[PDB]
Design an enzyme around this catalytic site. Structure first.
Site, PDB file in Angstrom:
ATOM      1  N   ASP A   1       0.813 -26.722-184.574  1.00 28.31           N
ATOM      2  CA  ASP A   1       0.603 -26.139-183.253  1.00 28.31           C
ATOM      3  C   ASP A   1       0.523 -24.615-183.260  1.00 28.31           C
ATOM      4  O   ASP A   1       0.554 -23.998-182.195  1.00 28.31           O
ATOM      5  CB  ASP A   1       1.750 -26.520-182.316  1.00 28.31           C
TER       6      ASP A   1
ATOM      7  N   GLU B   1       1.886 -32.690-183.710  1.00 32.61           N
ATOM      8  CA  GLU B   1       0.650 -33.355-183.317  1.00 32.61           C
ATOM      9  C   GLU B   1       0.471 -34.825-183.722  1.00 32.61           C
ATOM     10  O   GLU B   1      -0.654 -35.272-183.954  1.00 32.61           O
ATOM     11  CB  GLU B   1      -0.572 -32.514-183.705  1.00 32.61           C
TER      12      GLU B   1
HETATM   13 MN   LIG Z   1       2.397 -30.558-180.197  1.00 36.11          MN
HETATM   14 MN   LIG Z   2      -3.507 -28.545-185.589  1.00 34.61          MN
END
Ligand SMILES: [Mn+2]
Ligand SMILES: [Mn+2]
Length: 178
Positions: free
Chosen positions: A16, A112
Site C-alpha cells: 500500500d 492487499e
Molecule cells: Mn490495503
Molecule cells: Mn500494490
DNA sequence: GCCTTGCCGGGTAA
DNA sequence: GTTCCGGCGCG
DNA sequence: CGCGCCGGAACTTAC
DNA sequence: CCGGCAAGGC
C-alpha cells in the site's frame, strides 16, 4: 526480532505504499519510506508504533509524518538511511528466513489480500514477487495458484487453496511472530 | 449437494 | 500509490 | 554550494 | 479489492 517487524512493514510498504527517491531543483533531494492507509486509526495506533520502534532501533533521526489526503492517510518517514534500509532488504528478499517470510506475507495480505476471508487471495502486478510468495507458501504446506486476474491492468492474483485455509490463517494471518 | 476457484466489471482505497 | 511545490537544516 | 528533512497536495491507478 | 457468475471436481 527487528528483522521480523521489518519484514512485516516491508509488506505493507510494497502493498500500500512506496519507496521514493526524489530529486528536486536543486540539487535538493528527498528519500521516502511510505505506507498509505484508509484508517487514520490503524496508522496512528498499529502501524506507526511498529515503524517508530524500528526508527529508534536503527537510530534514525527523521520523524514519522502523517499527512491527511482526500482518500487516505499517509505515513511517511523522510530518511535516506531508512529508504536504503528497505530498498536493500527488497533486493535480498529471496533469502528471507522463515520468520521473515511469514511476516512479509502477513504484511502483504493486510495491505492487499482478500480481507473478507470468504476467499484467500493476494493481488499484484508483480508476477515475480507472487511467484516468490508462492514458493514460500508451498514450503509452509499451503497450496496455491497464480493467474492473471485483471486483464485490464496486468494484475495477477495468488489464490490460496481453501483446502489449506486453517494452516494459512492460523500460522500466518494470526501469527504472533514479532 | 456442496465446495472450490477462474473470470470479469465497479469503484474504494490506495 | 507517485511526484510535483515551497520551504528549512546542515557542514 | 550541495544535498537531505519537512509539510503539504495534485494527479494517478492498482487492487 | 470486492463480489457475483458459472464451470468443474468429488
Ligand atoms: Mn490495503
Ligand atoms: Mn500494490
Amino acid at each position: 526480532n527487528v528483522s521480523g517487524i521489518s519484514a512485516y512493514l516491508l509488506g505493507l510498504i510494497i502493498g500500500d505504499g512506496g519507496l521514493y527517491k526524489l530529486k528536486y531543483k536543486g540539487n535538493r533531494s528527498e528519500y521516502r519510506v511510505v505506507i498509505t492507509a484508509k484508517s487514520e486509526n490503524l496508522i496512528k495506533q498499529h502501524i506507526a508504533p511498529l515503524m517508530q520502534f524500528l526508527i529508534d532501533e536503527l537510530n534514525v533521526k527523521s520523524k514519522i509524518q502523517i499527512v491527511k489526503g482526500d482518500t487516505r492517510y499517509e505515513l511517511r518517514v523522510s530518511s535516506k538511511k531508512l529508504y536504503y534500509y528497505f530498498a536493500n532488504m527488497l533486493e535480498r528478499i529471496r533469502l528471507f528466513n522463515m520468520r521473515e517470510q511469514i511476516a512479509f506475507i502477513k504484511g502483504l495480505y493486510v495491505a492487499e489480500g482478500d480481507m473478507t476471508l470468504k476467499r484467500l487471495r493476494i493481488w499484484n502486478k508483480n508476477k515475480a514477487l507472487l511467484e516468490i510468495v508462492s514458493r514460500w507458501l508451498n514450503n509452509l504446506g499451503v497450496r496455491n495458484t497464480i493467474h492473471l486476474d485483471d486483464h485490464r491492468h496486468g494484475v495477477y492474483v495468488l489464490n490460496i487453496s481453501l483446502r489449506d485455509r486453517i494452516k494459512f490463517v492460523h500460522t500466518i494471518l494470526s501469527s504472533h511472530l514479532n
